[PDB]
């Protein structure tokens, strides 16, 4: 009652179906994600088990306009639909659509923004390549893979008696 505009973040507590706009004030639980994760850099577990499903804007038309009755609450004016390609390994944002709703329940949509990410598919891609270049690189001799001198890729370091040898 104190504010004219509201930006609402939906975590699954309300409908995202195109057939009808969601209410400002809703009931029901939100929904957990499959890609659940924790962070510990602050010395305690912080855990994220949800993600935003949609974002929507509401206006307090009764305070803004005249001739408004019943105080039904804020009325949405616009929303974004966030679809995720969700798996336990990762949850990525793949679809963003802006839609609006007409006062008669009709729905107006814009062409969505589609996103795609690379896939990890070892079940199809496991290409064995013989390597002749790592000649005599023996795990049980004085050999190691290390980057020296700031280079991004490791070279082959051999530690001899009296000298080190290196292949960058």
């Amino acid at each position: 009652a104190d504010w004219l505009f509201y930006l609402v973040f939906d975590y699954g507590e309300r409908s995202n179906n195109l057939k009808t706009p969601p209410a400002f004030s809703t009931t029901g639980s939100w929904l957990c994600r499959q890609d659940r994760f924790s962070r510990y850099e602050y010395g305690f577990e912080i855990r994220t088990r949800r993600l935003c499903r949609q974002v929507l804007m509401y206006h307090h038309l009764q305070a803004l306009d005249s001739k408004i009755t019943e105080h039904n609450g804020p009325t949405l004016v616009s929303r974004l639909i966030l679809n995720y390609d969700e798996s336990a390994i990762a949850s990525t944002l793949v679809f963003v659509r802006r839609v609006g709703h007409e006062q008669d329940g009709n729905v107006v949509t814009l062409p969505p923004l589609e996103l795609a990410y690379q896939d990890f598919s070892p079940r199809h891609h496991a290409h064995w390549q013989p390597m002749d270049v790592l000649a005599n690189f023996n795990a049980i001799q004085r050999w190691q893979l290390v980057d020296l001198k700031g280079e991004g890729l490791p070279g082959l370091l051999y530690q001899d008696k009296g000298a080190w040898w290196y292949r960058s």
Binding site: D35, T48, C52
Partner: peptide, 9 residues
């Protein structure tokens, strides 16, 4: 990293 808006967002 990950987030409330999905990985990388």
């Amino acid at each position: 990293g990950n987030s409330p808006f999905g990985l990388g967002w």
